[PDB]
UniProtKB/Swiss-Prot annotation:
Function according to Swiss-Prot or TrEMBL: Isomerase involved in the biosynthesis of oxetanocin A (OXT-A), a nucleoside analog with antitumor, antiviral and antibacterial properties. Catalyzes an oxidative ring contraction of dAMP, forming an oxetane aldehyde. In addition, shows methyltransferase activity in vitro and is able to catalyze the radical mediated, stereoselective C2'-methylation of dAMP to form methylated 2'-dAMP. Also catalyzes the demethylation of S-adenosyl-L-methionine (SAM) to S-adenosyl-L-homocysteine (SAH).
Protein name (record): 4'-phospho-dehydrooxetanocin synthase
Any GO MF annotation of the entry: isomerase activity
Family: Belongs to the radical SAM superfamily.
InterPro entries (alphabetical): Cobalamin-bd (IPR006158), Elp3/MiaA/NifB-like_rSAM (IPR006638), OxsB-like (IPR034532), rSAM (IPR007197), rSAM_horseshoe (IPR023404), Tetrapyrrole_Bchl_Biosynth_MTs (IPR051198)
Chain segments annotated as transmembrane: none
Stored SMART domains: Elp3 (SM00729)
EC annotation from Swiss-Prot or TrEMBL: 5.3.99.13
Length: 729
């Protein structure tokens, strides 16, 4: 092969490899056709490995002549060649993109890659709209970039069924099978596992079996009881899979494999230490094998630009699986991976909107440069030809922290401005509470006024907001925290319209939003905070391994009460404890609010479903229903608390709200927090929901809104009217 004809094969390979959405078997197909075409030499076998900018073709003429093409990267950085021969190459050399290896017998053994099949489970009835699965996509890209294995990806999100999974597995004959098992997928996982082991027993498969993600990590005993040879990946999967591949080659013993729990021969459960992955530089662009099918389901692009939480102190948030340190992608890798995913999505006409999976997008570094890192990512996005939109999550104190200097906070505001400039769209802030006592119980580290100011600053930059809010928690005593929460949620001095920066410095804008009451009033949207709450009337869920669960167990012993039911055991499928409230009135209110939600779910689901596809004028009508429902749901709790503990100010607000909707006389005990009385009070309040749904009914009859073909709004409205006051579950 001439030195000029190297160049031609590289040129065409670069064009093949640029199509990063194709599965590796499809890439190999195009490589075979390119090499059979020139017919200026024949070969026995080809292998493609690597990914995106390091994709590599091996052409095995036989074991004594092996050609290696690396169009996108210096072959000297190839990790498979480096494992085979750490000094094969010349250090003083122009970059090398081709090399023929002659009489290199052991290189062939390195090119016999094991096969790994990774399966993302999905209960499709609960999640109709897929998102690119990072759980398996990053495990695949890590293995491909290290050239450790041929990886097959199966995603139940796009409709692949249990029986199709097994068919796939029989056809590919993998050496390692891995299932990602998430909340609510225990039964599905056990079904797939039963069939895998049934076929191992029958001799149709021989594979190391492993499961990963949070459900088996937290509850390994229920898995080991049914599958005692199963290997559970406790934390990150990358090095775990690397080491199972080594163990396949007898290069590691089982008790050396990174980050797994297993049953040894004596019957005892072992856990191996998990070395935290070098995420900054070893985990590349998620594999995009499934992207085409995801686009057919109108699915979403996703990326994780950091792992972990440097704060890690919220008492309801368990840190054992996700870890207590923050590991960011480099600015360079973040921009590259975003470019890859956006280019691949554009190929399938997926719109350029990235959902960042990060637990904490902004983070914190020992050198304090985290804000400059974000600004540098934003500057890179602003250099692109096309704009993007992106969503992410952040704590309120990643916006505003009065324990830090004014200069820290002013630079924080500049950072958030660059986020808005680069496309920050809907941002989730974990406010969680409006009550300083409850915030302390939540370990949030924030105050209620600090939360208000964070919302002011972000909303003023034109970023749209969503907030988590956990109204009820089991250790709350009395109604005081609920009153503080309701007052917080009714504040109208928090949400700002997008403010034109004009000539203001960052410091002047910051100063005005903190202190200038007239500025705040002029720019407010006038909407109360509860309008951006993600889930109204939410109650605490007590997950395993949390400080909050231990706080509960500690109240159980200190006041001699049995709060954790199921005889102290947790639920494996949901990774949480079933727990009752220390204050029985508060538990009654939480239960009532869940029943309220259940009673309106069918009709409000239908309204929201119709809203997705309505014309502009119907969309606004249906949206106004959803706004009014949220409003009625907020003042349900204000009304319940009023009937348990009245005050003058709350009475005025409820009377204002009634009078505002021409329905002050629709409503006509006290201090009685029994379930019976609360239900009776809520039956009364439900008359206000009836008044809203009578308008929906009239609008439907008038043709002002349009029903689905199966008459779903008609059907659910009819049921709702017939079910009034009838709180059976
Ligand atoms: C997207 C998302 C959702 C989506 C789910 C989308 C989907 N795919 O169906 C929605 C919005 C529906 C959701 C809901 C919930 N979620 Co959520 N979610 C996330 C989020 C933001 C991103 C997930 C992701 O892509 N992670 C990145 C990938 C790379 O990580 P991974 O899945 O853990 O995979 C790694 C390891 O687990 C391991 N691994 C995974 N699979 C496998 C397989 C094998 C074989 C092996 C060996 C290893 C392995 O290797 C991988 C790479 O290192 C995460 C935050 C996060 N960054 O993880 C929260 C998170 C997972 N969610 C969480 C929670 C609590 C919930 C809810 C209960 C809501 C709530 N907060 O009350 C519900 C559950 C609903 C249900 N399903 O029943 C918690 C989980 C508990 C915890 N603290 O660890 C997280 C961490 C957020 C938080 N801090 O509160 N979630
Ligand atoms: C939407 S995710 C993103 C959280 C992310 N760590 C952050 O800091 O912003 C978590 C949100 O779900 C809600 N949530 C989490 N755990 C919960 C629990 N155990 N019970 C009730 N709500 C919970 C909280 O409102 C929280 O803000
Ligand atoms: S809730 Fe958010 S900030 Fe709190 S520990 Fe969990 S990831 Fe970190």
């Amino acid at each position: 092969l001439s030195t000029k004809s190297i160049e031609y094969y590289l040129k065409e390979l670069k064009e093949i490899f640029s199509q990063i959405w194709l599965k590796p078997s499809e890439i190999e197909k195009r490589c075979e056709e390119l090499f059979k075409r020139s017919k200026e030499f024949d070969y026995k076998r080809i292998l493609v490995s690597g990914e995106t900018d390091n994709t590599t073709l091996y052409v095995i003429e036989d074991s004594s002549k092996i050609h290696v093409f690396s169009p996108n990267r210096d072959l000297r950085e190839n990790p498979l060649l480096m494992r085979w021969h750490p000094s094969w190459y010349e250090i003083e050399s122009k970059e090398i993109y081709y090399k023929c290896f002659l009489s290199c017998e052991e290189l062939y053994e390195h090119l016999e890659l094991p096969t790994v099949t990774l399966v993302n489970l999905c209960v499709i009835e609960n999640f109709p709209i897929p998102r690119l699965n990072l759980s398996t996509g990053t495990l695949s890209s890590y293995l491909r970039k290290e050239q450790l294995a041929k990886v097959e990806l199966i995603d139940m999100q796009v409709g692949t069924t249990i029986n199709q999974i097994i068919k796939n597995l029989l056809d590919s004959q993998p050496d390692i099978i891995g299932l990602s098992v998430n909340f609510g997928q225990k039964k599905l996982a056990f079904e797939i596992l039963d069939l895998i082991y049934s076929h191992i027993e029958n001799g149709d498969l021989s594979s190391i079996i492993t499961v990963g993600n949070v459900i088996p990590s937290f509850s390994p005993e229920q898995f080991f009881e049914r599958y005692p040879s199963l290997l559970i990946c406790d934390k990150e999967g990358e090095y775990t899979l690397r080491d199972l591949i080594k163990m396949l080659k007898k290069e590691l013993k089982l008790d050396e494999v990174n980050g797994i729990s297993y049953v040894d021969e004596s019957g005892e459960v072992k856990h191996n230490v998990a070395e935290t992955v070098n995420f900054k530089e070893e985990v590349p662009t998620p594999s995009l094998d499934i992207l085409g099918e995801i686009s057919k389901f109108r699915g979403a692009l996703t990326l994780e630009t950091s792992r972990g939480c440097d704060y890690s102190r919220c008492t309801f948030c368990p840190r054992d699986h996700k870890l207590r340190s923050w590991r960011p992608l480099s600015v360079e890798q973040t921009l590259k991976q975003l470019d890859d995913i956006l280019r691949a999505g554009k190929h399938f006409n997926i719109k350029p909107h990235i959902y960042m999976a990060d637990e904490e997008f902004i983070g914190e570094l020992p050198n304090g440069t985290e804000a400059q890192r974000i600004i540098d990512i934003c500057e890179g996005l602003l250099k692109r030809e096309e704009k993007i939109k992106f969503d992410f999550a952040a704590r309120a104190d990643s916006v505003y922290e009065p324990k830090r200097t004014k200069e820290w906070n002013v630079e924080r505001l500049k950072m958030w401005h660059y986020c808005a400039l680069a496309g920050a769209d809907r941002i989730f802030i974990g406010v969680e509470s409006g009550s300083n006592q409850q915030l302390k119980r939540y370990g949030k580290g924030t105050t209620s006024e600090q939360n208000i100011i964070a919302l002011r600053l972000v909303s003023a930059l034109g970023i749209n907001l969503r907030i988590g809010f956990i109204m009820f928690d089991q250790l709350m005593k009395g109604l005081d925290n609920l009153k503080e929460n309701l007052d917080f949620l009714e504040r109208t001095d928090a949400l700002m319209k997008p403010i034109d920066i004009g000539d203001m410095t960052y410091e002047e804008l910051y100063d005005k939003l903190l202190n200038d009451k007239e500025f705040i009033e002029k720019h407010k949207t006038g909407k109360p905070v509860y309008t951006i709450v993600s889930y109204m009337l939410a109650s605490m869920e007590i997950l395993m391994n949390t400080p909050y669960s231990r706080m509960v167990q500690l109240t159980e012993r200190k006041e001699e009460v049995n709060l954790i039911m199921n005889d102290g055991k947790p639920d494996m499928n949901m990774g949480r404890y079933a727990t009752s409230f220390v204050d029985k009135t508060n538990g009654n209110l939480s239960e009532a609010c869940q029943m309220w939600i259940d009673s309106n779910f069918g009709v409000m689901y239908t309204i929201k479903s119709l809203h997705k596809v309505a014309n502009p004028r119907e969309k606004k009508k249906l949206y106004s229903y959803m706004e009014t429902h949220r409003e009625i749901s907020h003042f349900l709790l204000k009304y319940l608390v009023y009937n348990l503990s009245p005050d003058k100010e709350s009475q005025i607000i409820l009377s204002d709200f009634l009078r505002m909707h021409s329905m002050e006389h629709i409503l006509d005990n006290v201090g009685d927090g029994s379930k019976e009385n609360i239900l009776n009070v809520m039956t009364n309040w439900q008359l206000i929901m009836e008044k809203l749904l009578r308008d929906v009914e009239a609008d439907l009859n008038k043709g002002i809104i349009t029903d689905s073909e199966d008459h779903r709004l008609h059907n659910t409205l009819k049921r709702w009217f017939s079910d009034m006051g009838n709180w059976s579950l």
